[PDB]
Coordinates of C-alpha atoms and ligand atoms in Angstrom, one line a residue:
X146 CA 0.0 0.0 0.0
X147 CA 1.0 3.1 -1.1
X148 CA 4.7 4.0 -2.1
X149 CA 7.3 1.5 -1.9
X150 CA 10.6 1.3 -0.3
X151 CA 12.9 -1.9 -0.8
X152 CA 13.4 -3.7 2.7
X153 CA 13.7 -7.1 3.4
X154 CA 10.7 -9.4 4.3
X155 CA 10.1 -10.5 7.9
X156 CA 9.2 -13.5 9.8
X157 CA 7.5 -13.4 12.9
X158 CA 7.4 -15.6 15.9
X159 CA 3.5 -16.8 16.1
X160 CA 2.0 -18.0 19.1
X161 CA 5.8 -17.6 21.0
X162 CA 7.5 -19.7 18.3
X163 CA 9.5 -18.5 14.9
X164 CA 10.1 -21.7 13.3
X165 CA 12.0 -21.3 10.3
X166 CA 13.9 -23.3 7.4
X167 CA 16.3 -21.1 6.4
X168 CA 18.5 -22.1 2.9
X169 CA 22.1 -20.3 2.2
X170 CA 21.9 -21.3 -1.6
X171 CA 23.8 -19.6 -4.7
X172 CA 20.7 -17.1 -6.1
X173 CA 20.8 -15.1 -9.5
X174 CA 18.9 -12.1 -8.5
X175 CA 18.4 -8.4 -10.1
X176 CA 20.8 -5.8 -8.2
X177 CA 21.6 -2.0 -9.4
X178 CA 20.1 -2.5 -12.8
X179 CA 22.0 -6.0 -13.3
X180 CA 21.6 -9.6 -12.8
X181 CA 24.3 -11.2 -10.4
X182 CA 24.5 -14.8 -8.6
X183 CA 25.0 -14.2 -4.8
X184 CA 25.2 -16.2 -2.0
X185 CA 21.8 -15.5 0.2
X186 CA 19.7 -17.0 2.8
X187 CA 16.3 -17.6 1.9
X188 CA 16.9 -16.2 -1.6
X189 CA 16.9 -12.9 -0.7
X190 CA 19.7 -10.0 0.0
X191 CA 19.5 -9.0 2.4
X192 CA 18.4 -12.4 4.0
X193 CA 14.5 -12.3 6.0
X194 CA 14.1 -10.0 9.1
X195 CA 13.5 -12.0 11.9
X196 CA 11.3 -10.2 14.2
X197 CA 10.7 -11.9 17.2
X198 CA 9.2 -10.8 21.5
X199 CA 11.2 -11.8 24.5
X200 CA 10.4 -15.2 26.1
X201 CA 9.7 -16.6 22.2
X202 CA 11.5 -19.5 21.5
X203 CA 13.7 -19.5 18.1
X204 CA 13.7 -22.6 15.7
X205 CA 16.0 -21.7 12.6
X206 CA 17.0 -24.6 10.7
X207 CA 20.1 -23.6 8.5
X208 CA 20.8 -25.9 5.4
X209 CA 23.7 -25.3 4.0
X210 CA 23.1 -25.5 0.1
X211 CA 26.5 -23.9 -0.5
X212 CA 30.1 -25.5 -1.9
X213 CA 31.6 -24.8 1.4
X214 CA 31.1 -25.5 4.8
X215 CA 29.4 -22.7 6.9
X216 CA 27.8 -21.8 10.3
X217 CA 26.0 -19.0 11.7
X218 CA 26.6 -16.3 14.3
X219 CA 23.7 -15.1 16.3
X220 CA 25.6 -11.0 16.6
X221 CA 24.5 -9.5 19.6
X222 CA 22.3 -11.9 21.3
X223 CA 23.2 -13.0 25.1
X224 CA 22.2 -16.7 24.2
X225 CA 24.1 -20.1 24.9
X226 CA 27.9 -20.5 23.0
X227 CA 26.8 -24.4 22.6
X228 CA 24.0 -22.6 20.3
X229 CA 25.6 -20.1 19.2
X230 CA 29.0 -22.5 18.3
X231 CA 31.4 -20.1 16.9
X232 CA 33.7 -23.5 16.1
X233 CA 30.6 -25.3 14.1
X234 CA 31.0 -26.6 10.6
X235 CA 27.9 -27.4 8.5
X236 CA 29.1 -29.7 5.5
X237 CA 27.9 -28.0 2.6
X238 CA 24.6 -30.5 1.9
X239 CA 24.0 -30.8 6.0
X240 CA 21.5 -28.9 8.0
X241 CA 21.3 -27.6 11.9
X242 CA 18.5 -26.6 14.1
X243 CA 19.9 -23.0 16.4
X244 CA 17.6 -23.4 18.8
X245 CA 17.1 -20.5 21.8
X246 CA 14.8 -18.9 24.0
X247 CA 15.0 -14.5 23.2
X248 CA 15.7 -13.1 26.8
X249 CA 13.4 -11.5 28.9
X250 CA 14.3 -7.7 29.1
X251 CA 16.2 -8.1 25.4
X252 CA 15.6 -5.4 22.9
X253 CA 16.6 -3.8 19.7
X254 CA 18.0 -4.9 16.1
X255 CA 20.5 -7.6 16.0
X256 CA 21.7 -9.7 13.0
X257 CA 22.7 -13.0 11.3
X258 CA 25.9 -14.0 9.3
X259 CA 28.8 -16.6 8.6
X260 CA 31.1 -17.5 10.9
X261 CA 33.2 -20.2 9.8
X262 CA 37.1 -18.7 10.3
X263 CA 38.6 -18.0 7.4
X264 CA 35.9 -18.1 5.0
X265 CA 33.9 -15.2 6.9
X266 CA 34.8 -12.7 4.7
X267 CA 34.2 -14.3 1.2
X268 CA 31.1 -15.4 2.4
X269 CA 29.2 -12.0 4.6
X270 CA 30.6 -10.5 1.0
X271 CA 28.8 -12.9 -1.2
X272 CA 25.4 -12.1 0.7
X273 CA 24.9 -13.7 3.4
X274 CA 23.5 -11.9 6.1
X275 CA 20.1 -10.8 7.8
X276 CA 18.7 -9.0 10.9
X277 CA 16.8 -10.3 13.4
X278 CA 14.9 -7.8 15.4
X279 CA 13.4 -8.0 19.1
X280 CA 10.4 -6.2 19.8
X281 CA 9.9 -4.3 22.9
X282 CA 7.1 -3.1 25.2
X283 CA 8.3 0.2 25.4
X284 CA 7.2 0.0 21.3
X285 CA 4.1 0.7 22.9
X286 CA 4.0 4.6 24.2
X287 CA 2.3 6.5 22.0
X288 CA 6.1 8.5 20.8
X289 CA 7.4 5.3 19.2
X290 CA 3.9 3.7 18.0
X291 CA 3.0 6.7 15.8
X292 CA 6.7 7.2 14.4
X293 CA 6.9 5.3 10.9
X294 CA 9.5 2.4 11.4
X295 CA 12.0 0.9 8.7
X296 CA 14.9 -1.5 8.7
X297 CA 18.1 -0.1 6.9
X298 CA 20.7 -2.8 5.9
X299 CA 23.8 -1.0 5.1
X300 CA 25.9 -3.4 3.1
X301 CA 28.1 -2.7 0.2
X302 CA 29.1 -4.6 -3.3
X303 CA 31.3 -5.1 -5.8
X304 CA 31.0 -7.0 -9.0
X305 CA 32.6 -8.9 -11.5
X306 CA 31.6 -11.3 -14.0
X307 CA 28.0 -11.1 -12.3
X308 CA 29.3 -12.5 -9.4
X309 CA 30.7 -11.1 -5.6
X310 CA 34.2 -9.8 -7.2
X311 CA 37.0 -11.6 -5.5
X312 CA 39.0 -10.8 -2.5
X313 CA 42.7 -9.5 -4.0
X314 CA 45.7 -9.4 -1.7
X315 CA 44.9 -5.6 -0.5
X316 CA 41.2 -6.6 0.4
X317 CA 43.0 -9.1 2.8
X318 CA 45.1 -6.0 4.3
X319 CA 42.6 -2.9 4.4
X320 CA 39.1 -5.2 4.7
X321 CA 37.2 -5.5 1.4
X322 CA 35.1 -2.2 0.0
X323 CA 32.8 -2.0 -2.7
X324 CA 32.1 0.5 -5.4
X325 CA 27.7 -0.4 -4.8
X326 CA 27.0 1.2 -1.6
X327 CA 23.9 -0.5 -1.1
X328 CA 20.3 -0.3 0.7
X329 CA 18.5 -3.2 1.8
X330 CA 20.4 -4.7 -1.5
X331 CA 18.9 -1.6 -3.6
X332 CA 20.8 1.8 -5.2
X333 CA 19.8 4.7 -3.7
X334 CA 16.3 4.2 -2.9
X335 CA 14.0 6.7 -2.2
X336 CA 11.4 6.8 1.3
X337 CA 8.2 8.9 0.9
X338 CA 7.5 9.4 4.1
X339 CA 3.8 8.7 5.1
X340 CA 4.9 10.2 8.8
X341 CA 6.5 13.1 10.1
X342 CA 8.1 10.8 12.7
X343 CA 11.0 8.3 11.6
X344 CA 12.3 5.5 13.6
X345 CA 14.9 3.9 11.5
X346 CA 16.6 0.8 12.3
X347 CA 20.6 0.9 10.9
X348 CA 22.9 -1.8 10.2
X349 CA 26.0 -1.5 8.8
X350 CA 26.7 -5.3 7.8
X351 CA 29.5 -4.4 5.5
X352 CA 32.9 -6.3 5.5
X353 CA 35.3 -3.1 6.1
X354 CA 33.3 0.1 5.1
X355 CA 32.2 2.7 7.6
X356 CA 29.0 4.7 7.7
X357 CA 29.3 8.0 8.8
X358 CA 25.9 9.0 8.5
X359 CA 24.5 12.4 8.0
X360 CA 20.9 13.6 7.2
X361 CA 20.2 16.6 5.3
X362 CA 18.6 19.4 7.6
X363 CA 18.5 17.4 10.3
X364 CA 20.0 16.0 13.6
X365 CA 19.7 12.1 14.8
X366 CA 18.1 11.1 17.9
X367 CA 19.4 8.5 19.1
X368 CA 17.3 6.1 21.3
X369 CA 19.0 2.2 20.7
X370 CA 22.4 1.5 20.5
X371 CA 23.6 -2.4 19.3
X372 CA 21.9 -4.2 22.5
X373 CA 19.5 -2.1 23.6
X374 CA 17.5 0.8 24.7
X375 CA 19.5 4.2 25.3
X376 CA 18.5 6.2 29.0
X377 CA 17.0 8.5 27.0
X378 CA 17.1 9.8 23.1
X379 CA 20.8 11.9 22.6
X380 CA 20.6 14.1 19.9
X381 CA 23.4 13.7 17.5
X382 CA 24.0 15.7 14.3
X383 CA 26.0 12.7 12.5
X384 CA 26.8 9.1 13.4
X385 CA 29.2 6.7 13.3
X386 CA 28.7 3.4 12.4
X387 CA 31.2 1.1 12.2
X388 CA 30.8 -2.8 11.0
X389 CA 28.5 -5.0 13.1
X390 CA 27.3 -2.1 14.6
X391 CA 23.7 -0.9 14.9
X392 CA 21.9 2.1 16.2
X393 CA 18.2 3.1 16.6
X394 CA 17.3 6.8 15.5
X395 CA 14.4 8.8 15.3
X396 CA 14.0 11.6 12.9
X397 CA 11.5 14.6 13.0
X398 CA 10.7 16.1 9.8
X399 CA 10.2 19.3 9.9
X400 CA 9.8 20.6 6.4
X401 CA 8.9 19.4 3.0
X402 CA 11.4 18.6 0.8
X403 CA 13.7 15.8 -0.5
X404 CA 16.8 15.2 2.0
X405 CA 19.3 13.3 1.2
X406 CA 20.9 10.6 3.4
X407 CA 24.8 10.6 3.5
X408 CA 27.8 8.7 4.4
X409 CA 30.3 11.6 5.0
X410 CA 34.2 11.1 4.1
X411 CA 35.5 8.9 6.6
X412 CA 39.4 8.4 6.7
X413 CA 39.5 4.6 8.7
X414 CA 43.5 4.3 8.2
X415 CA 43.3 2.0 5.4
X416 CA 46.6 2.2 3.1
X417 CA 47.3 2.1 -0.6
X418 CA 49.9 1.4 -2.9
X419 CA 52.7 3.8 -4.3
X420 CA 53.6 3.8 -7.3
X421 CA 54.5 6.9 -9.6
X422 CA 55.0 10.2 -7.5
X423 CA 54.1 13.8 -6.9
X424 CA 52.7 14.4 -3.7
X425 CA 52.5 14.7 0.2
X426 CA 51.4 11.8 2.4
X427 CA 50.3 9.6 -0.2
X428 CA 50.6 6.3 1.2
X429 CA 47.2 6.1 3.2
X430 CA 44.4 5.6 1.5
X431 CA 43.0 8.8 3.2
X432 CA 38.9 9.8 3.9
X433 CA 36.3 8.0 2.1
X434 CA 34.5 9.8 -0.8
X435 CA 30.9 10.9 0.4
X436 CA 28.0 8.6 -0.9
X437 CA 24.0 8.9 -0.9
X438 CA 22.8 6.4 0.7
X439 CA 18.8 7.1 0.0
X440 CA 16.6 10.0 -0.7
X441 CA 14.1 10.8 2.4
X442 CA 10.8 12.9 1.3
X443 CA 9.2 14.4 4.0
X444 CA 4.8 14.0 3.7
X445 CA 2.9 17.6 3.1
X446 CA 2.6 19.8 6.2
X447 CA 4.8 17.7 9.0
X448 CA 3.7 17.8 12.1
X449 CA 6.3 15.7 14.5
X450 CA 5.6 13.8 17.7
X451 CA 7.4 14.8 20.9
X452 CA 10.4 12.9 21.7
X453 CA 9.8 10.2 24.3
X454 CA 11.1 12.1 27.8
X455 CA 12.6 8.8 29.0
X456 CA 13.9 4.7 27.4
X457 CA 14.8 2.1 29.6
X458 CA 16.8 2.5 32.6
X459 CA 20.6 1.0 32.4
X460 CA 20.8 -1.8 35.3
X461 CA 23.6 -0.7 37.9
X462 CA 26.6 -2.9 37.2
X463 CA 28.4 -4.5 40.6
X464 CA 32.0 -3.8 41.0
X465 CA 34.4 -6.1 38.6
X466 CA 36.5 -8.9 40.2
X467 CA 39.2 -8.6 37.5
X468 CA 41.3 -6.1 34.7
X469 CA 42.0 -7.6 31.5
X470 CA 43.9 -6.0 28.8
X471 CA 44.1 -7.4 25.0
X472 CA 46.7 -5.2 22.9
X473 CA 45.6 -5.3 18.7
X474 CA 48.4 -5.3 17.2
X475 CA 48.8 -5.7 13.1
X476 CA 51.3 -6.5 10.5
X477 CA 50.1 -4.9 7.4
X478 CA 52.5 -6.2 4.7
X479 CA 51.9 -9.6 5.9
X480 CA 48.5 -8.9 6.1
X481 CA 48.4 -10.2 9.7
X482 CA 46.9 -9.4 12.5
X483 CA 47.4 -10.2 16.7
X484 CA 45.8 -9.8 20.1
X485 CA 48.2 -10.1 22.3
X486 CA 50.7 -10.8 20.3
X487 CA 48.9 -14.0 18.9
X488 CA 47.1 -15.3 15.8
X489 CA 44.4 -17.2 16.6
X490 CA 43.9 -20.6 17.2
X491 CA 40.9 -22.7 17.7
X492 CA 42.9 -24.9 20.2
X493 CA 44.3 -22.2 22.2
X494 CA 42.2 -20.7 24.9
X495 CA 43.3 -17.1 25.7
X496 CA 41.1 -15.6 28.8
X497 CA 39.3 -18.3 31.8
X498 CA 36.6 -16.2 33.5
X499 CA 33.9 -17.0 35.7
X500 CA 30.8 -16.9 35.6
X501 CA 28.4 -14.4 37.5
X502 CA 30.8 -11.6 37.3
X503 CA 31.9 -8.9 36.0
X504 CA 35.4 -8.1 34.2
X505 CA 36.7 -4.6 33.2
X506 CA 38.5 -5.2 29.6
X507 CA 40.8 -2.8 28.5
X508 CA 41.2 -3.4 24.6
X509 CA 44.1 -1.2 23.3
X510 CA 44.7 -0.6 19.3
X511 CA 48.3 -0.3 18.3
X512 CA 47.8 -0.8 15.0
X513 CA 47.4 2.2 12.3
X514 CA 43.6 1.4 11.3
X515 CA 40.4 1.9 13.1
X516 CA 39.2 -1.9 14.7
X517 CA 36.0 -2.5 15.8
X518 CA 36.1 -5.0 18.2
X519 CA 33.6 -7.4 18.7
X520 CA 32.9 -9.8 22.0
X521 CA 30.0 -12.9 21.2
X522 CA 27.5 -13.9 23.8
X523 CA 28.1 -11.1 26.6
X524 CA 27.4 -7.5 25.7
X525 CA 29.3 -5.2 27.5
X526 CA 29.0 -1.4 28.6
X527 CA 31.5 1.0 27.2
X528 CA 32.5 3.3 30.5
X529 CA 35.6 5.3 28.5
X530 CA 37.6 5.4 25.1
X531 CA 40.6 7.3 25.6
X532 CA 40.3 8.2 29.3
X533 CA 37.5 10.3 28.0
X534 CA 33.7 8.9 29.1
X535 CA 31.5 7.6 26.5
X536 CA 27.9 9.3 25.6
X537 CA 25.7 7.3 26.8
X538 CA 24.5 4.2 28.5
X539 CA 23.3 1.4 26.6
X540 CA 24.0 -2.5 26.3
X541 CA 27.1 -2.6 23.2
X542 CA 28.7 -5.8 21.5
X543 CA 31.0 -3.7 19.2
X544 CA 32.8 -0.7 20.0
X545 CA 35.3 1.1 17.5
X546 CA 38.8 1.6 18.1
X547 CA 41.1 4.2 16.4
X548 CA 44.5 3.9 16.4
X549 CA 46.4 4.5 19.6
X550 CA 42.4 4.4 21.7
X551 CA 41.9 2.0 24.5
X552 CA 38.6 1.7 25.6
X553 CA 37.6 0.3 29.4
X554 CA 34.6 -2.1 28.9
X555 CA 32.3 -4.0 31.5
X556 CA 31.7 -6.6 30.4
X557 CA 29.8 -9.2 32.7
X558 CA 29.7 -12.7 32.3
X559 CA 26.5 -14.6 31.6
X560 CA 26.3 -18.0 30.1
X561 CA 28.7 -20.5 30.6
X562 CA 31.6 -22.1 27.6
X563 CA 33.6 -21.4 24.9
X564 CA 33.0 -18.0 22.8
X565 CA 35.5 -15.7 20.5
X566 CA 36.2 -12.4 20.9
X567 CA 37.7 -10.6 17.1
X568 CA 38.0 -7.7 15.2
X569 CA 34.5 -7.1 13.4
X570 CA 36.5 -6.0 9.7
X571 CA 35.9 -9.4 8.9
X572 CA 38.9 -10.0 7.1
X573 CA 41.3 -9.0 10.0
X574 CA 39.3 -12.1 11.8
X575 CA 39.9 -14.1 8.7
X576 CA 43.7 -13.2 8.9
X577 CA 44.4 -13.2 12.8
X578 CA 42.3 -11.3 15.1
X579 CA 40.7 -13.4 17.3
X580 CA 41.5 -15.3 20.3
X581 CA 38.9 -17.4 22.7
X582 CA 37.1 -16.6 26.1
X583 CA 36.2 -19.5 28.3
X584 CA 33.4 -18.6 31.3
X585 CA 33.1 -21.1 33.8
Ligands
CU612 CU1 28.8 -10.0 13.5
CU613 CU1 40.7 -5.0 12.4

């Protein structure tokens, strides 16, 4: 009804229960005016939006129709490491059953995507990825329920021959960019806005490339960060969003007109190659060039809601019973990349925590490049990057890292077993960064 906007379809849970068969097959499909084979779940790109309440129970059958093994990761959501199995292999032909219950006071936009080491990045490039969103009851007040809600997969492409193009040695180095900068798997699309009140879900499920996002004319207000509800919406006039991250805005619409989404230049570290001469500092690759993401039209005569006065309250953390520190370090040449020192290794366990407590990590970047680092089943709470306090207060599972910032996490321990902890530039994973947590 009415105009349309590409986004992908959803599943919901039904009577407490999403029960799903889920397929990662090669699929021909039409993308920016061409035909190309990807590799998608359910034979879409981006993949189905779960959408799912707390207490439901989760029944995803996987079936792996693809020429190599694969697995999934379940990014962001506090659930079991025996279901969430970051060391699984699914035999291309062989199925699996993730089965989980959502947690009670969960909440916001989470996501779906390979995580078989060393064949991550080849294959979240090919296609296959998804969200899975978690309903909440604060959905309910009256300055969310009227605001018009849409998904946003951010997720870039490149082509060649019809097909993802292949990964080339400086892909391996920098993390793999595309020339499509894509949303919900379309070019530029454009949202007629039917309210004056936005509530936009973003995901930047891109290997390597940064968002940072700008709206025409307007200001961000931020109410959801990667795991949850925000204290309260924080105004913002531009936002960073690095990969694996999400964020929940709302945007008032003041005027008519036609704004245009943006990712703004963004200089992430990334290096090039030299070879001819004339220049300054000419070896980094240096900002990104700015890119329209979509075009927003605001409906005639906006009137916008009132901004929700309060979110969700951030539970009081208890005091931390251990300091950890993990230095990334990189090796760029090599195309290498170390926590600690170390590459990782499946058989190695790196950090032996318990469980019902809290740690304080201190994660350090002493590379050159910005590294978002990512921690599986246990969110954690940014406190500081830099000795300097973060924003706001909000459940995270990726926070960025420039070169030379630490950042002091909380980061308490839930369930119990074996989980990773990488860089989220899925390449650096691919070539190093990673090492394994066991809570017990
Ligand atoms: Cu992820
Ligand atoms: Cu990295």
């Amino acid at each position: 009804q009415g105009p349309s906007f590409p986004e992908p379809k959803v599943v919901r849970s039904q009577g407490g229960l999403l029960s799903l068969k889920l397929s990662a097959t090669p699929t021909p499909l039409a993308i920016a005016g061409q035909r190309a084979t990807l590799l998608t779940y359910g034979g879409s790109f981006p993949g189905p939006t779960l959408r799912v309440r707390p207490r439901d129970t989760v029944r995803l059958t996987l079936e792996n129709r693809l020429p190599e093994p694969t697995n999934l990761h379940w990014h962001g959501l506090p659930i079991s490491p025996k279901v969430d199995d970051p060391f699984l292999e699914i035999p291309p032909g062989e199925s699996w059953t993730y089965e989980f219950t959502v947690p009670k006071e969960l909440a916001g936009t989470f996501w779906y995507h390979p995580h078989l080491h060393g064949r991550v990045a080849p294959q979240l490039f090919a296609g296959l990825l998804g969200a899975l969103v978690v309903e909440s009851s604060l959905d309910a007040i009256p300055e969310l329920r009227e605001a018009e809600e849409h998904l946003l997969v951010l997720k870039d492409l490149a082509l060649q021959g019809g097909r993802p193009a292949p990964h080339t040695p400086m892909d391996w180095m920098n993390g793999k960019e595309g020339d499509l900068v894509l949303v919900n798997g379309a070019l530029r699309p454009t949202l007629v806005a039917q309210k004056a009140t936005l509530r936009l879900r973003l995901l930047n499920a891109s290997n390597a490339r940064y968002y940072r996002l700008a709206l025409q004319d307007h200001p961000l207000y931020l109410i959801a960060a990667d795991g949850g509800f925000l204290e309260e919406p924080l105004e913002v006039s531009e936002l960073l969003l690095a990969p694996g991250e999400r964020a929940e805005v709302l945007v008032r619409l003041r005027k008519e007109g036609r704004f245009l989404l943006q990712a703004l230049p963004y200089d992430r570290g990334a290096m090039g190659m030299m070879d001819m001469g004339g220049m300054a500092h000419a070896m980094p690759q240096g900002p990104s060039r700015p890119e329209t993401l979509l075009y927003l039209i605001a409906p005639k005569n906006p009137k916008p809601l009132p901004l929700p006065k309060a979110l969700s309250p951030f539970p009081t953390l208890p005091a931390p019973v251990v300091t950890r520190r993990l230095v990334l370090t990189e090796d760029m040449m090599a195309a290498r990349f170390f926590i600690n020192g170390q590459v990782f290794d499946h058989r190695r366990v790196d950090l032996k925590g318990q469980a019902q407590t809290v740690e304080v990590w201190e994660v350090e970047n002493q590379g050159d490049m910005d590294h978002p680092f990512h921690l599986h089943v246990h969110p954690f709470q940014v406190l500081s990057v830099g000795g300097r306090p973060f924003p706001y207060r909000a459940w995270k599972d990726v926070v960025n890292l420039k070169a030379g910032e630490v950042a002091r996490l909380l980061v308490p321990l839930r369930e119990k077993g074996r989980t990773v902890f990488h860089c989220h530039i899925v390449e650096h994973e691919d070539r190093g960064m990673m090492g394994v947590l066991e809570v017990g």
